[PDB]
Symmetry: D2
């Protein structure tokens, strides 16, 4: 994976409702980024456009794989450079009334390597005073995207308002991010007070470079952005920033500096996990079985998994729907688990419970945990018995037949 | 509770190992704070002293209620002013080798209204390079203290390094804090890069005033502090700061400004709780029973409680140790609970499990949850059956007799 | 004179065309300042009002002068506090279109203690896309006003745009200022970029506190201000700043601190007076006196003087108008003068020449300086002879001399 | 001349007394700059070394000049890049204790393009508790060095402490600078408070990019530097800054941007030249020419000139040494001159007077100016007569005049 020094360029622009003009601006900077042999170029949120009306910023929503986007993918190839499209107006075939705010990272091939959907939207609705609903022009993302590996390092993905919620960034760092990102279209009055401080703060708390390509100037009579597109190092210093205008800045991030800081200031090893736990709901994929004590549970027997736990079908179902929920960390007692695990184990149990009832169509479930010899534990590895109930109350090939049905319901 | 405008003074000093000199400096500023009719004065971490050796910063550790401290309590009375003693070297009768870093808030009567023990310590130990262990000169605090009500508003308590962990502050705001605090003795090189940014960041993310009284200058040949004691408003502006020297600054915080901002920018109503949850382990006191569906469980029947859940002794114990764990929020199904609740419910179940086994001296427990008619739920309110096991397997006056024994073990 | 600690209050506001609303905003803050026993409060630049157009600002100037000006003097007296009125629209009796932008300092008794007229105005005339003319709603000052002594120290005076010019502030510091002031109404876009840096820079490079009450928010549909009213110390630290709204902030200034810095960082003792000189046109006021060699020139005979020079009538003039320009420092050679003194001495000669030619109605003048025994110098003190000339051309009573001096004095 | 965008690199380092280590640090960065095709790199103030004592700094100055100076010129040529050596210990052949602090600009061919000697040194002598004397390890410059043209623009030159003095920077901007430079080694405690604000302020008030490579970290047990090497744009934005360590940062500067700002914010067209004047002693270099009324004074006869004035020998001198001082702008009256011109004209007269008296060995001088027909003025162009005087006292060949001018020219 990425290591050492890497040269990158951050783009600042003032997008119109004139998609061609907007494109030309960007293309011009990307070309210059290539000329300087940058490995990656970052563009701001709303890089595609910023319409006058909303029947406009919903009518122009693209497909991520459209003819406009191809112009970008074509550029990435042409200049052998990765791209960070800060926040595309992602049209949703089903709900055209609510596009997505998608941050895309593209290959030197033009191949999308990652997509992140703005998770936090601004919704203010004060009875008879003011009503500004971002959730009216767009739609929030539904899941947590982990950082992506790039030639310049582990890049955490976020967008604008996201910067305001520390939990999201702490998580990305925990998932091994080296650089955080916050392409944005900040307000002049908000940005002039919170932009630099919030970005520098994120970089310092997570000890990561922060790359924030932004919108600046007036997009139209009723909209102006703060600008100040910058790059912050893992120590909180602003090592690169654009001048007040449509232009770019350059930075040479050094992944080694990140390592040095994390080593000399092990903050993430100082967190009192015995007092607080930042739980995140993440859905991971198991391209290989998992250890249930000494036994090996086949990936085809697992229908849901997260970085802390997994759910697998039983070899001796005490009743239809009877599955198991155990922590990836091989541990026998519940009292041996850490809050992160305890919390994730039962929140997963909750997600699984609801699904088993929608399927086996019932309205009752029993959660049992045999922790100890005297309690009936037949295997030294914590497992939650989740068994749906009704009125009454194994084929290795048929066990994966069950696991498949559930996997599509999780 | 506190409302409106309130005038406060922040003290900056460079403490010696000369407790009398240090005292005089502080007393002088407190007197001036009184003269200006301030309602509260904040002093920095290590306000009592900063010794040359460690056999010194462990020998001088006080009692919180000693003759030195009385000088302060006497001052609070004399000038009718609340005090924030940023970080006293709190001697522990049992472990004299590890004092506490205690932030105290004192009455206009000299009455302690709150104590907070530094939760985060700096411990760096790189094999053959450098070894700086804060946990060698002192001892971390063991529990989470909630904000205290003061005449100037809901004051969240923290100390120095704490500022580096966002979770702690998000929690304090959630517990209704209006002002956060971070009295400190920051390093010149660290502070010159992270002080203002981290404080301004906390104020902005939690929309609270931030009061940080600090140490400055050189305490001795081998120790210098950053200083820059300040006050930040809920918008991130530094409204007051001390000059580079032993002196104070004044600020008039306006709790209404806090309300305005929180209303016009409802960030804490934008957090995706469906994706992440900041769980905190807090121990609350129930000076009154709780609703277990429609029934009323007596406080004397409850041995442990938190802002999300409670544990009470059963009216029909299926076996010794058989207790119940339910969420304060009256809900029937597990799938009706929020991650905060799910997580806290079972982490409490974990804490309770371990205690029941240390007492009933056994090594097995069963966790059951009858969620639904068909599962055997006899009451429409989620409750976890926690029943310790062995080989074999109600007096209202004797039920509180059990609850009392456990309460002292929780 | 003032020394020690002093408590002050800085006010921020959003002035519009509602004199009563602006006044009530200012009054509220002055009252709170008085309640906290502040010795002085600072109001921002257009504290009186910001009109929607030229004609309205003319009407408002009259309505302000007529009703509110005195109301502030009353507040000053009632709350026993000094006021710094950051820059009112001072209506000019003979030019209603161009009032001055006056910074007024009012004492505890409501008495004007000093008046600064904004010297720097922003004039942008781009035939193509722009025309922003501040001199179309105003008129720049005419004199350099030295710092005023106040209960909080030597206060230098200026108004926003003045910050961009270092010359102005360096001067005030040299003239004894311990605090500089920059009451103002900055544009949101320009303030958002230069406000803090400039105010802090002036503080640091001049080693003075900087007090800058400012306008903030939306005044009208097409006028916005940055805000961020603050107080910066002599080391450049922002010790107090208003929150984003119509409100105030408090700061205790310490003149001791200024002194301490001036001593551990004697920056002003390090200037290369030999390479560069900052000359300033300043007319001095004097009880009298002044030596010319061992001679005592009575004030009656001195009609113009600056911190560096003085001009006086001649007992034995070689011709009508023959006056003398001399440095206050008593030295004989022109080569004894410092660049600062040489610049002033001849720039003053330039002013006297013009004054004399207009008065005596001549069009020629001879400037002569005899430096040395062999050049005919009669007294060991540099003096420039300024001789008006006529086509004819080549002991006087005290009464004649005093009169001639009175005449010239009122033409300078 | 240079226009458009230009890529540059700024270097930060922790120089000590190990010339080889410091050089390898600098070399590494210059190579990386070359690899990125930068047109110019900036090294900090004491890039050569920081010694543990007076004697070591003298030894190191020799060892530097002997081996490393040329090595940098080689790097310049090899990597086809221009160098800005922030302030080497320039050993003075006749005073080993007081070298100059020279800022050198080396071009692509390793040729010195310009040399600035630090004009401002920090001297603190408090009989009581302190004695910090920079002039004890150095010697201040002697001349004002105007900006140098480079592939990246008009570069003004300075070294750290110079930032505190606005005069120096205002001048460079007036002399055409598009970028100001402040290579340096700031104290950790002073930089931590004034570094960013001052650099940014100079940028804003002069509308120039500011390039400041700096020392950082611990040099030795009792010497620390702030660091934070950066590049500020004409609007005051910090566009590039090194991380906390021995490393570099990159910035693309745009001369177009400077221009644009200079036009939408014509700050320098707004200065009150009528109230204050910033005079600077500068000796001009000239191909020749210069008119005196309708007369063409050949360079052969001009022995001293500044941006505002020139002095020349006389065809019909009334006495040995009779020369003339005149403003370059052709105007007849002394009252036609601007304060800037009046200050310069007589400060130059002051210098010529001294030069002539020492040369002709006299002790008296008569300075005379005839302004107007009736004052005897013969040509309609201001000219000051400078007449050396003797006890005796009161057409010349081109050869005599040219010679006399050569003599005087080498004494100014
Ligand atoms: C909704 C993408 Hg700007
Ligand atoms: C709509 C927040 Hg960039
Ligand atoms: C351990 C209190 Hg400074
Ligand atoms: C020891 C951290 Hg203030
Ligand atoms: C022109 C006075 Hg605000
Ligand atoms: C003096 C009454 Hg307008
Ligand atoms: C001329 C800006 Hg208040
Ligand atoms: C005195 C040159 Hg660093
Ligand atoms: C020029 C050899 Hg030291
Ligand atoms: C004289 C400070 Hg580099
Ligand atoms: Na499209
Ligand atoms: Na004690
Ligand atoms: Na000033
Ligand atoms: Na102060
Ligand atoms: Na004469
Ligand atoms: Na300069
Ligand atoms: Na630029
Ligand atoms: Na003559």
């Amino acid at each position: 994976m990425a290591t050492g020094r890497h040269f990158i360029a951050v783009c600042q622009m003032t997008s119109d409702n004139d998609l061609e003009k907007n494109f030309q601006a960007a293309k011009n900077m990307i070309e210059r980024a290539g000329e300087k042999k940058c490995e990656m170029v970052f563009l701001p949120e709303c890089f595609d456009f910023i319409g006058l009306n909303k029947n406009e910023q919903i009518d122009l929503a693209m497909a991520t794989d459209c003819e406009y986007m191809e112009k970008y993918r074509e550029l990435a190839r042409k200049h052998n450079i990765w791209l960070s499209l800060g926040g595309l107006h992602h049209k949703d075939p089903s709900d055209a009334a609510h596009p997505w705010n998608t941050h895309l990272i593209i290959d030197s091939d033009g191949v999308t390597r990652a997509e992140y959907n703005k998770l936090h939207l601004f919704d203010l609705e004060i009875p008879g005073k003011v009503r500004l609903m971002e959730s009216e022009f767009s739609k929030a993302g539904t899941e947590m995207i982990p950082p992506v590996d790039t030639p310049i390092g582990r890049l955490g993905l976020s967008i604008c308002y996201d910067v305001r919620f520390p939990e999201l960034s702490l998580w990305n760092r925990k998932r091994g991010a080296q650089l955080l990102s916050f392409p944005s279209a900040f307000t002049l009055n908000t940005g002039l007070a919170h932009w630099e401080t919030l970005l520098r703060a994120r970089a310092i708390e997570n000890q990561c470079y922060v790359v924030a390509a932004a919108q600046t100037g007036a997009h139209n009579p009723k909209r102006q952005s703060y600008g100040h597109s910058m790059v912050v190092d893992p120590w909180g210093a602003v090592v690169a920033q654009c001048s007040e205008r449509v232009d770019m800045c350059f930075a040479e991030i050094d992944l080694s500096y990140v390592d040095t800081l994390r080593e000399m200031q092990p903050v993430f090893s100082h967190r009192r996990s015995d007092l607080y736990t930042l739980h995140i709901n993440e859905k991971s994929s198991e391209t290989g079985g998992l250890k249930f004590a000494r036994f090996n549970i086949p990936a085809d027997h697992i229908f849901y998994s997260t970085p802390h736990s997994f759910v697998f079908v039983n070899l001796k179902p005490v009743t239809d729907g009877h599955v198991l929920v155990s922590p990836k960390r091989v541990v026998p007692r519940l009292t041996d688990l850490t809050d992160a695990e305890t919390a994730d184990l039962f929140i997963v149990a909750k997600k699984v419970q609801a699904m088993l009832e929608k399927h086996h169509n019932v309205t009752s479930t029993t959660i049992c945990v045999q922790d100890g010899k005297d309690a009936g534990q037949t295997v030294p590895h914590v497992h939650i018995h989740i068994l749906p109930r009704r009125a009454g109350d194994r084929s290795n090939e048929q066990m994966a037949e069950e696991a498949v049905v559930y996997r599509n319901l999780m």
